[PDB]
Amino acid sequence: DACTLLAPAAGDTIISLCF
Amino acid sequence: DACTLLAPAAGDTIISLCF
Amino acid sequence: ALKLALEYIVPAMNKHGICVVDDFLGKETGQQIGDEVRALHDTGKFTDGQLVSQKSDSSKDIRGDKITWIEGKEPGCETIGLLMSSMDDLICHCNGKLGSYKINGRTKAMVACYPGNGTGYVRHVDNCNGDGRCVTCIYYLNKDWDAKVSGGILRIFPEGKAQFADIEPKFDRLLFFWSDRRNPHEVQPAYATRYAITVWYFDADETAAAK
Amino acid sequence: PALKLALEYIVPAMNKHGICVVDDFLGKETGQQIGDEVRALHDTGKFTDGQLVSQKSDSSKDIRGDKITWIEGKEPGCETIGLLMSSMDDLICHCNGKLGSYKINGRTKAMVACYPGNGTGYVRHVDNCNGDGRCVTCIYYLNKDWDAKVSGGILRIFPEGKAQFADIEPKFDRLLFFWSDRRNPHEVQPAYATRYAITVWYFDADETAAAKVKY
Ligand SMILES: O=C(O)CNC(=O)C(=O)O
Ligand SMILES: O=C(O)CNC(=O)C(=O)O
Ligand SMILES: [Mn+2]
Ligand SMILES: [Mn+2]
């Protein structure tokens, strides 16, 4: 649907964390 | 811009009024 | 007509760009309009609200209402037609006194229903791009609406000021407000069936220029 | 202590309400220094228009009118922002096993964000609505002496299923947590003053793996 038309971009990078 | 992505569709017919 | 328009609506609109009129048609007429609207709904004719620039087949997350367009002449919508004649009467006796708009057109009537379940309408402006729509008029049909339980408040954010105007969608209430970027507004999530009838009035010059 | 806060305050508030506000997170001095670093980032023209997951117009101010910059935390000149990120991460990792079934194993960079007054904002939206892996949204606010009555910029959260909402003022040194998915639709209401905030999104291991397969 149109939900992603409103959602903030997460960036191109995921940084590992915790484990 | 993106403003029309949120704007209510007016349709296509206008009804003459007043004059 | 002349009385209420010249002496109440015109001042309120020019000073604030937002006018509320309660007990517009009275309980009997309001109730008949309610019956006609709910009849239209129970046929299943209502379709998903559309946007000026539509990108996805589904857009509930932008506007989650279902609607149907009425001219006012349909056999069985006589009381909605009466509502419309009343509105048009007022608006035409407003010409030359609403800012500088020369109103000479209107849309069909948009009968809209937010079907509870948290649906609403994100903050938006009705007329973004000078499409001619200068005055938005909405007639609400919701008896004993308790916003604390059902939500569905219309929050308007007058451009330029942090303050806002919350409008409950109360039965037999008639709302006016400037359609352009001065009055961005949202329907906050509703948790009960929310009915309203909308008419947009067009400005002669701006409409001709847009076309 | 980060630990006692995470177990005694953050985790219960998140599990019972999906929203958690921690005021005076780092203290006056550290918060001010973060304000300096973000204002410096801003004065050097590093900010660009906030982006949407699926953008259709190149100018989308009317969806979200904020200016953005992504910070890894290691950039020389961003040491205090890096400390903030370290605090947050330390806090989140000590929550694993205590946030329902979520196992946080990733995060975005830090999104430094500015709404430059003038009625800019962010219409009601859901951070993660297709299951992109983001489970917790974390936002650090930097706006001293914020008077919402004149400046607006309140974050209104609309917890799903209930007519209630939660109005979050973007107060200085305030740390906000909330579930990123459709439980917490929210909007930044128009701001008439410069509004700064730093956001980190945290990813769930399983949901992010699924997301990688889906995309
Ligand atoms: O129904 C309301 O009160 C408000 N509706 C709208 O903003 C619309 O349909 O464009
Ligand atoms: O900055 C805020 O208060 C809220 N921010 C957002 O909802 C966002 O950037 O997606
Ligand atoms: Mn509207
Ligand atoms: Mn968000």
Residue numbers in the entry:
A (entry chain C), B (entry chain D): 395 to 413
C (entry chain B): 190 to 400
D (entry chain A): 189 to 403
Paper text:
The PHD-catalysed hydroxylations of HIF-1α/HIF-2α in higher animals occur in amino- and carboxy-terminal oxygen-dependent degradation domains (NODD and CODD). The three human PHDs exhibit different NODD/CODD selectivities, with PHD3 being substantially more selective for CODD than PHD1/2 (refs 16). Biophysical analyses employing crystallography and NMR reveal that the molecular basis of PHD isoform and variant selectivity involves enzyme–substrate interactions involving β2/β3 loop residues (that bind the LXXLAP motif) and helices α3 and α4, regions which display sequence variations between the PHD isoforms.
A PHD2 R396T variant, present in breast carcinoma, and an R396A variant efficiently hydroxylate NODD, but both manifest loss of CODD activity. In the PHD2.CODD structure, Arg396PHD2 (α4) is positioned to salt bridge with Asp571CODD; analysis of the ODD structures leads to the prediction that the R396T and R396A substitutions disrupt their interaction with Asp571CODD, but will not directly have an impact on NODD binding. Interestingly, Asp571CODD is also important in VHL–HIFα binding, where it salt bridges with Arg107VHL3334; the high conservation of Arg396PHD2 and Arg107VHL implies that both these interactions are important in PHD–VHL evolution.
